Design a protein around this ligand. Structure first.
Ligand SMILES: *CC[C@H]1/C(=C/c2[nH]c(/C=C3N=C(/C=C4\NC(=O)C(CC)=C4C)C(C)=C\3CCC(=O)O)c(CCC(=O)O)c2C)NC(=O)[C@@H]1C
Ligand SMILES: *CC[C@H]1/C(=C/c2[nH]c(/C=C3N=C(/C=C4\NC(=O)C(CC)=C4C)C(C)=C\3CCC(=O)O)c(CCC(=O)O)c2C)NC(=O)[C@@H]1C
Ligand SMILES: *CC[C@H]1/C(=C/c2[nH]c(/C=C3N=C(/C=C4\NC(=O)C(CC)=C4C)C(C)=C\3CCC(=O)O)c(CCC(=O)O)c2C)NC(=O)[C@@H]1C
Ligand SMILES: *C[C@@H](*)[C@H]1/C(=C/c2[nH]c(/C=C3N=C(/C=C4\NC(=O)C(CC)=C4C)C(C)=C\3CCC(=O)O)c(CCC(=O)O)c2C)NC(=O)[C@@H]1C
Ligand SMILES: *[C@@H](C)[C@H]1/C(=C/C2=NC(=C\c3[nH]c(C[C@H]4NC(=O)C(C=C)=C4C)c(C)c3CCC(=O)O)/C(CCC(=O)O)=C2C)NC(=O)[C@@H]1C
Ligand SMILES: *[C@@H](C)[C@H]1/C(=C/C2=NC(=C\c3[nH]c(C[C@H]4NC(=O)C(C=C)=C4C)c(C)c3CCC(=O)O)/C(CCC(=O)O)=C2C)NC(=O)[C@@H]1C
Ligand SMILES: *[C@@H](C)[C@H]1/C(=C/C2=NC(=C\c3[nH]c(C[C@H]4NC(=O)C(C=C)=C4C)c(C)c3CCC(=O)O)/C(CCC(=O)O)=C2C)NC(=O)[C@@H]1C
Ligand SMILES: *[C@H](C)[C@H]1/C(=C/C2=NC(=C\c3[nH]c(C[C@H]4NC(=O)C(C=C)=C4C)c(C)c3CCC(=O)O)/C(CCC(=O)O)=C2C)NC(=O)[C@@H]1C
Ligand SMILES: *[C@H](C)[C@H]1/C(=C/C2=NC(=C\c3[nH]c(C[C@H]4NC(=O)C(C=C)=C4C)c(C)c3CCC(=O)O)/C(CCC(=O)O)=C2C)NC(=O)[C@@H]1C
Ligand SMILES: *[C@H](C)[C@H]1/C(=C/c2[nH]c(/C=C3N=C(/C=C4\NC(=O)C(CC)=C4C)C(C)=C\3CCC(=O)O)c(CCC(=O)O)c2C)NC(=O)[C@@H]1C
Ligand SMILES: C=CC1=C(C)[C@@H](Cc2[nH]c(/C=C3N=C(/C=C4\NC(=O)[C@H](C)[C@H]4CC)C(C)=C\3CCC(=O)O)c(CCC(=O)O)c2C)NC1=O
Ligand SMILES: C=CC1=C(C)[C@@H](Cc2[nH]c(/C=C3N=C(/C=C4\NC(=O)[C@H](C)[C@H]4CC)C(C)=C\3CCC(=O)O)c(CCC(=O)O)c2C)NC1=O
Ligand SMILES: C=CC1=C(C)[C@@H](Cc2[nH]c(/C=C3N=C(/C=C4\NC(=O)[C@H](C)[C@H]4CC)C(C)=C\3CCC(=O)O)c(CCC(=O)O)c2C)NC1=O
Ligand SMILES: C=CC1=C(C)[C@@H](Cc2[nH]c(/C=C3N=C(/C=C4\NC(=O)[C@H](C)[C@H]4CC)C(C)=C\3CCC(=O)O)c(CCC(=O)O)c2C)NC1=O
Lengths: 57, 324, 177, 162, 172, 172, 177, 172
């Protein structure tokens, strides 16, 4: 029932690997709910969800 | 084997065939002399019944070699004979001293009375005797009550009774009763929810919360989720258990909600190509995709279909599904 | 178990007040309407064998797949149990209306019968079709508009009371739901 | 609760990393200023009843309508003045908790999150608490680097009310 | 969700059973009171922040042990989450005022609300005494004769009480 | 998942030795049915709609409960829920028949099927007749050699009907 | 509790089948050479505790470090429970042979033995290494192929039932696989 | 995730009072022993795999059924996943060593870890041996006097042995 139009990929950075074991400084900070956060650290996830899906505005 | 309407019987395949086949009553007002294969069968019945199918060897049966002989003339069974077996070192090694006070209480109800106490007001009446009047009146708090002098007349053997509507316990005491009874191949110690070092029902027996009654021996019955309360008053954490309530706008957005109970995943299984990704097999922070297994989900009716795919293409077995 | 008379006490306990004249005005009118409720529950329990007759022989004509060989009311123990499982749940709401509080219904049966029933294998939509067949069976009896048996009451209007036994039986059905 | 120690743990846990020499100077620099910050926490603790009631009167001198206007959100009564002194005592207590842990952890969790829901509901102005905190900033009577640590966590509270 | 018209669809829906003529003249009585329903929901939600903050203020007056330190509603995180749940019941009661039945109030808001509170540890007897302030601040708000010509809603104000006492017995 | 070649290697690693030569010519009987498995797939994958129309033609006739007002499959999405559930019990059996075991059958369909019908209230009585109305409908459909030569296929008719009854006992 | 006489009556009551004599011929084949089951049961229950005598002794000769520090059959208490652990499951094998179904090893033993042996850390590989040793130890008394002993038999093919114990030995490693 | 400083702060706020004078010098004691605690975790991160491979080769020489064909930790996909769990608990005790408490340790590692070891079928008594095989190697380098000035660091390595003991209890 009308599948999607079969587009094509390109060259990007996310579809190769980095060879970055122990990544240093520009890690983008995995906020997660398996690390069992406290109630002040659930609040640092909800701000990161609002900053990602909305903007900072 | 599994079946509810398979041969018209709902609970013979739940694990209670021999607990509903036998009745274990004794027929003579004193044990007759001469024949020692008709009343030693009663004793080794009670040595698995009262101790909860624990291994009593003969190296400790001959340590307790007085207390059955005084039953053969002088004590009654169920009122005095397993009462004397409840005052032993072998009873005090398994159900009193490796575990806390409530865990000694809540394993004694399965041993003595054949039920699970509900709430804490049944834990109130039993633990008002230990802190005032020792251990011997603590064990004999059970044996001289209305809960013991009515269900068994004094020459049967105390069975399990925590599933019937004549045993007016609760409806939650059904749901604890198959946490306590896992077929006829377990014990107090060979029980995964609590070993001898632990306590079976800390939160759930107190707060009367009912649980997922899993049929034992099923595919993926190796699951029990752990405990961490949530909230900032009790300074708890978030992320360990899915909620038992399912309220809100995602309550009735996708229809009626459900609670699934996943047994556990591994690292081979996530890809849709039947193998392991050969490489470093991890991220940099060296955790799994499901970094602890035996997890659970809350999901509505209109997304039961892709979630049942996404568990089963990934190596997760399902314990049960309960609606909320 | 809670009473409605007990309900104003714990209302007045965390508030740490005494009992005033303000919340007392609900309970003194509850006294003089007590006989009207006492004229209700005696006919609920005395036509109870008809209400468990039409509990289970009525739900089985609108899904006869349980008397089929393989169904969930096929054998004569499950035939016996379905006659028995319904005559306890109207015995409990006869207790619940004299206290007025639904918590005696909750802690005794309605905390956890749903978790048993999918391990006992019975369907819940069959149950609430058998719950609601006692619902309108109940509310005929309190008002005296029942057809084949008409009983002795006084004259008035207990439609505040007749909503209350309808306020119980949906939560009977929502507990299984 | 963010501390310097529970922040360098978190960037070590992001990379799967054992605690290297990078994360052993973030926790060492807390120890070279835990000396000056714990004297400031001990000094603000002792002079609490001077600083709380003095700041409650300095609000009432700048905003005299708050002691005059009727209605429950104002300091015109006995119990209205008692709840204002409770509030500056709540504010000054979280300053001293930050000097113990070395960062703005305990006033993020117990004070700042959910504060604007209260100040709009109960009709309390955020400029009533700037004047209470600007008293405490230049009347604690500390000096040197002991004053530098107390003046850091006081105007963190001014910037979350502004 | 279900309103009153969606009741007798699914109450006949499960037999096929059509709509009989003796029921719908009671339902065309309900549209005579359709204009006395929508003023009354407009009476509640115009004052929707003056019934909340006037009854949380009269809750902490009689119970000072919730705002004392170590109390349940002590911090500013847990004060905002006390005024959040005091307004949540004010939404889902007035949703049940406009619809004609309870079945969105006790399916989206009261299905496990006291067992939410037993797990968190909030006093479930004390949320009922804040709701019964909001019952008395709204029933006595919806008997004013300003803004409307005086009409007897005495039938329609018992339905507004009857969901406020349904949240009073849900949370204990 | 693991297959019929994998289990005799799963008992070659969990036991821990090299290969016995009696383990090698037991796989000759797997290719004595190896071509004969392949045309058996053509009797079920070319008749995918053909079995699941001809079975649910029969199933509401002697059992008219499903089409009752108040029956199970009443709305058209529930009647489409039957057709998406009748075929997968035959589809994963068709995955099990090309496999030679029931590992992927238990992995992706069966484990989680007794309790899922019990939570929804769809009966365990009549989801086994949907096995049984397609059980005899593929015993006839696969026992004919229209296109392939003639010999012994008396093993594999007791293997695809050795998988429907496995699905029958794993649901009741 | 199921047996092969009553395996069909939980099969035929899905059909409500009054059993005419077509399906009963397998039961008339069950009563035909059930003496070969009976002549094998007396070849099992008289030679029963020498099966378990080389079970764990056959396990520990190739898996040696379970009597080491940090084992599982280290002490006398740790070892003698294992010899009753194997003798219980071979007692429950031969209940199913004279009955004719796979009833008794599932509805008592493997209604919860997978969570048993992981509550204690019983190693599942070594608790099937002994039972695979006890697989071929239990076929030799039926076969009369043994190096050491001969049982007084009559000479036919019991290979339908010589692998039926191995068709009970497969589903004891169903859950503890 | 709490610290040693944040644990005594959070007990003060739930009582609602300032920190006592006996509590500041209890923490002023804790900051002057900071360079001892910085010298401990510098010893067990400069040998953060020479602890682990020498604890693995100690355990594998002692218990031989781990490396046996058919074993729990036999194959090389269950060997790095054995060395993953031996390396993260040396990581997460060293986070709990620098914090001063172990509420980082149980919630980010040990909350239900013996329940996931139940699901995998892992012998958990031997991993508790491997923590004790790592525990004494960790204190043998904490007591090593090379390169540091000599003093008394007695109760700090009994704190470090208590963190390994809390890890080794709740994995069986
Ligand atoms: C001997 C090789 C010469 C050389 C190679 C070189 N290439 C890169 C970086 C990238 N190459 C790609 C291209 C792809 N990535 C993909 O995943 C795919 C499949 C779709 C392609 C075609 C990309 C995206 C990068 C950048 C990201 C990355 O690091 O992988 C680099 C790295 C540059 C750096 O300094 O990091 C090198 C060195 N360069 C030479 O000098 C050789 C002549
Ligand atoms: C030498 C150690 C003992 C041992 C270890 C062992 N563990 C696994 C597999 C898992 N362990 C976990 C638990 C966690 N993983 C984490 O990353 C974290 C931090 C968040 C925890 C708490 C999980 C989830 C797995 C499975 C996924 C994975 O590979 O990480 C295994 C592999 C078992 C398997 O079936 O793959 C082994 C071998 N086992 C032993 O024998 C030693 C005593
Ligand atoms: C007509 C046949 C019988 C019947 C079918 C029936 N099934 C459902 C609902 C579900 N079935 C499943 C099971 C699966 N879904 C999958 O995608 C897979 C493979 C991965 C399986 C094994 C699930 C998850 C549901 C719920 C979601 C859905 O609807 O698909 C229903 C609907 C129940 C309802 O009341 O709406 C029906 C009717 N039921 C019968 O009575 C017939 C005998
Ligand atoms: C007057 C305040 C009373 C009180 C409130 C209180 N509630 C909570 C926490 C929760 N309440 C709920 C219930 C709901 N949340 C919803 O979003 C909805 C509608 C969809 C309902 C019915 C839930 C889920 C929580 C936990 C999440 C949260 O809101 O924080 C708290 C604790 C807050 C915390 O962070 O721990 C309080 C204090 N408790 C009282 O003592 C007053 C009587
Ligand atoms: C005992 C007989 C009581 C009594 C009970 C009442 N039954 C009422 C309605 C009703 N009764 C049945 C049962 C019967 N009718 C059928 O069609 C079938 C088979 C499917 C059976 C067994 C049904 C189904 C119903 C309708 C309820 C429903 O499904 O919603 C009833 C209300 C009618 C009235 O009398 O006003 C009552 C009171 N009647 C008595 O008075 C004696 C004491
Ligand atoms: C007691 C002597 C019985 C008896 C038992 C049988 N044992 C049988 C087979 C068998 N036994 C072992 C263990 C043995 N082999 C070893 O290598 C070691 C030590 C390292 C020991 C203790 C094994 C491995 C096997 C084979 C099982 C298999 O193939 O996996 C057996 C079968 C035939 C046979 O050997 O006789 C029997 C009948 N024999 C008796 O008759 C007395 C009564
Ligand atoms: C007990 C565990 C040890 C031990 C510890 C001592 N170290 C002492 C002083 C010291 N340690 C360092 C290095 C350390 N401090 C840091 O700030 C950092 C990283 C940034 C590291 C690795 C320094 C620089 C110093 C001197 C100044 C200071 O204290 O920070 C010390 C005091 C010496 C004394 O007692 O007079 C002790 C006891 N010493 C031992 O012998 C065992 C092995
Ligand atoms: C030996 C072949 C195995 C092994 C055996 C162990 N079994 C242990 C304990 C145990 N096993 C059972 C199940 C058994 N009892 C029954 O009633 C039934 C079914 C009817 C069966 C199968 C129970 C109930 C228990 C616990 C009894 C108790 O100790 O009270 C066990 C542990 C003993 C201990 O902890 O000291 C062992 C070692 N494990 C092995 O590694 C070999 C391969
Ligand atoms: C008929 C309207 C129902 C129905 C009835 C059945 N109930 C069955 C078993 C059963 N029910 C309970 C709960 C029972 N005990 C109580 O105290 C109360 C009231 C508060 C009730 C309802 C229990 C504990 C059991 C199991 C009894 C036991 O195991 O001894 C049952 C099956 C009997 C059986 O499996 O042997 C039936 C048929 N089920 C239906 O399908 C309709 C909806
Ligand atoms: C004092 C400078 C000014 C003032 C104060 C005033 N405040 C209130 C009431 C409340 N203040 C809070 C604030 C907090 N609670 C917290 O837990 C925290 C974090 C630790 C803060 C900042 C809250 C929740 C209330 C309401 C509950 C209470 O009674 O305390 C009042 C009373 C308002 C009322 O309606 O009763 C007053 C008078 N107002 C002034 O006039 C001063 C200028
Ligand atoms: C010994 C056993 C025993 C009882 C059976 C009740 C008997 C009883 N019923 C009512 C009295 C009444 N009962 C009803 C009730 C009803 N009338 C209706 O029209 C409806 C059909 C029905 C329920 C709504 C009404 C309206 C009254 C009169 C009002 C009153 O005085 O209570 C009264 C008070 C007046 C009187 O004395 O008659 C008493 C004592 N009490 C008992 O002690
Ligand atoms: C969009 C929002 C919206 C509303 C809220 C209603 C508001 C509304 N109410 C009335 C009209 C009226 N409204 C009332 C109502 C009341 N009198 C009381 O004493 C009670 C306090 C209160 C009920 C809650 C009465 C008694 C009348 C006049 C009688 C009548 O409607 O015929 C009218 C005039 C037309 C009419 O008579 O029906 C309108 C527009 N309509 C709307 O379009
Ligand atoms: C490449 C894909 C592929 C297929 C589509 C099938 C089709 C197929 N089957 C056979 C070959 C055969 N096919 C059958 C099958 C049957 N005969 C019966 O009696 C049964 C009713 C019926 C099964 C449905 C038999 C018995 C043989 C072997 C012929 C013989 O026994 O002599 C052959 C000849 C080559 C061979 O012997 O392997 C082919 C092409 N096999 C394949 O390899
Ligand atoms: C209470 C004790 C008691 C019993 C156990 C049975 C004993 C018994 N076993 C067999 C009989 C037999 N037993 C065997 C079996 C074998 N022959 C072999 O060499 C194989 C190794 C092995 C196959 C596994 C065979 C082939 C027969 C004869 C066929 C038959 O079963 O009738 C027979 C039939 C012979 C006859 O009619 O006399 C009897 C009565 N009866 C009893 O009263």
């Amino acid at each position: 029932s009308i599948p999607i139009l079969k587009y094509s990929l390109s060259t990007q950075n996310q579809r190769v690997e980095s060879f970055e074991v122990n990544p240093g400084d520009e890690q983008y900070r995995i906020y997660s709910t398996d690390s069992l956060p406290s109630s002040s650290e659930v609040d640092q996830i909800i701000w990161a969800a609002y900053r990602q899906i909305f903007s900072e505005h | 084997r599994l079946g509810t309407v398979s041969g018209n019987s709902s609970l013979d395949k739940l694990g209670l065939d021999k607990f509903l086949s036998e009745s274990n009553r004794a027929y003579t007002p004193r044990a007759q002399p001469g024949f020692s294969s008709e009343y030693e069968q009663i004793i080794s019945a009670t040595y698995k019944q009262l101790f909860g199918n624990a291994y009593i060897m003969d190296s400790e049966r001959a340590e307790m070699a007085k207390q059955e002989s005084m039953f053969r003339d002088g004590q009654l069974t169920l009122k005095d004979f397993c009462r004397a077996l409840a005052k032993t070192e072998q009873y005090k090694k398994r159900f009193f001293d490796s575990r806390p006070l409530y865990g000694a209480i809540e394993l004694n109800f399965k041993n003595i009375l054949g039920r699970t106490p509900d709430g804490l007001e049944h834990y109130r009446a039993k633990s008002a005797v230990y802190d005032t009047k020792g251990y011997e009146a603590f064990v004999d708090a059970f044996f001289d009550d209305g809960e013991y002098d009515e269900v068994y007349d004094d020459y049967t053997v105390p069975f399990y009774r925590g599933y019937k509507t004549e045993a007016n316990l609760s409806m939650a005491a059904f749901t604890h009763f198959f946490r306590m009874v896992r077929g006829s191949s377990t014990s107090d110690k060979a029980n995964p929810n609590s070993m001898q070092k632990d306590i079976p029902l800390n939160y759930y027996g107190i707060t009367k919360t009912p649980l997922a009654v899993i049929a034992p021996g099923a595919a993926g019955t190796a699951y029990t989720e752990s405990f961490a309360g949530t909230g900032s008053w009790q300074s708890g954490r978030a992320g360990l258990n899915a909620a038992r309530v399912a309220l809100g706008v995602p309550a009735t957005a996708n229809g009626k909600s459900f609670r699934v109970e996943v047994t556990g995943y591994t690292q081979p299984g996530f890809g849709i190509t039947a193998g392991t990704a050969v490489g470093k097999l991890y991220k940099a922070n060296k955790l799994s995709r499901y970094p602890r297994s035996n997890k659970s989900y809350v999901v509505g009716f209109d997304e039961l279909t892709p979630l049942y795919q996404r568990i089963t293409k990934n190596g997760g077995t399902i314990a049960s599904i309960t609606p909320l | 178990m809670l009473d409605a008379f007990s309900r104003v006490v714990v209302n007045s306990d965390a508030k740490a007040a005494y009992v005033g004249g303000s919340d007392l005005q609900a309970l003194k009118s509850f006294i003089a309407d007590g006989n009207k409720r006492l004229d209700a529950v005696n006919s609920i329990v005395s036509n109870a064998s008809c209400m468990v007759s039409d509990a289970v022989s009525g739900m089985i004509c609108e899904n006869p797949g349980l008397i089929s060989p393989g169904g969930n009311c096929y054998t004569n123990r499950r035939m016996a149990a379905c006659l028995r499982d319904g005559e306890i749940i109207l015995r409990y709401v006869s207790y619940a209306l004299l206290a007025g509080d639904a918590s005696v219904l909750e802690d005794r049966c309605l905390n956890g019968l749903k978790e048993t029933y999918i391990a006992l294998g019975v369907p819940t939509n069959s149950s609430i079709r058998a719950v609601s067949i006692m619902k309108a069976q109940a509310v005929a009896f309190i008002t005296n508009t029942a057809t084949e048996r008409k009983m002795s009451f006084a004259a008035g209007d207990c439609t505040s009371l007749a909503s209350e036994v309808a306020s119980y039986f949906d939560r009977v059905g929502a507990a299984i739901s | 609760m963010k501390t310097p120690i529970t922040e360098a743990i978190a960037t070590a846990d992001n990379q799967g990393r054992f605690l290297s020499n990078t994360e052993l100077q973030a926790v060492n620099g807390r120890y070279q200023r835990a000396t000056a910050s714990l004297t400031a926490a001990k000094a603000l603790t002792g002079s609490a009843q001077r600083l709380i009631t003095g700041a409650a009167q300095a609000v009432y001198n700048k905003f005299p309508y708050t002691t005059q206007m009727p209605g429950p959100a104002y300091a015109s009564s006995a119990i209205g003045k008692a709840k204002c002194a409770r509030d500056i005592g709540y504010y000054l207590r979280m300053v001293t908790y930050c000097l113990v842990v070395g960062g703005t952890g305990p006033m993020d969790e117990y004070l700042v999150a959910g504060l604007e829901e209260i100040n709009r509901s109960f009709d309390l102005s955020p400029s009533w608490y700037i004047e209470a905190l600007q008293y405490i900033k230049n009347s604690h009577g500390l000096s040197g680097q002991v004053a530098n640590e107390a003046n850091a966590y006081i105007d963190y509270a001014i910037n979350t009310l502004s | 969700m279900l309103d009153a018209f969606a009741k007798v669809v699914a109450q006949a829906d499960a037999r096929g059973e059509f709509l009989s003529n003796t029921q719908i003249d009671a339902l065309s009585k309900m549209v005579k009171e359709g204009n006395q329903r929508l003023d009354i929901v407009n009476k509640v939600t115009s004052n929707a922040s003056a019934i909340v903050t006037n009854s949380a203020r009269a809750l902490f007056a009689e119970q000072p042990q919730l705002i004392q330190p170590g109390g349940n509603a002590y911090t500013s995180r847990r004060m905002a989450a006390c005024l959040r749940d005091m307004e949540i019941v004010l939404r889902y009661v007035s949703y049940a005022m406009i619809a004609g039945d309870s079945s969105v109030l006790d399916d989206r808001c009261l299905n496990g609300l006291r067992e939410t509170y037993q797990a968190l540890g909030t006093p479930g007897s004390s949320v009922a005494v804040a709701i019964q302030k909001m019952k008395d601040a709204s029933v006595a708000l919806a008997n004013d004769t300003t803004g409307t010509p005086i009409g007897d809603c005495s039938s329609l104000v018992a339905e507004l009480a009857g969901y406020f006492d349904r949240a009073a017995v849900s949370v204990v």
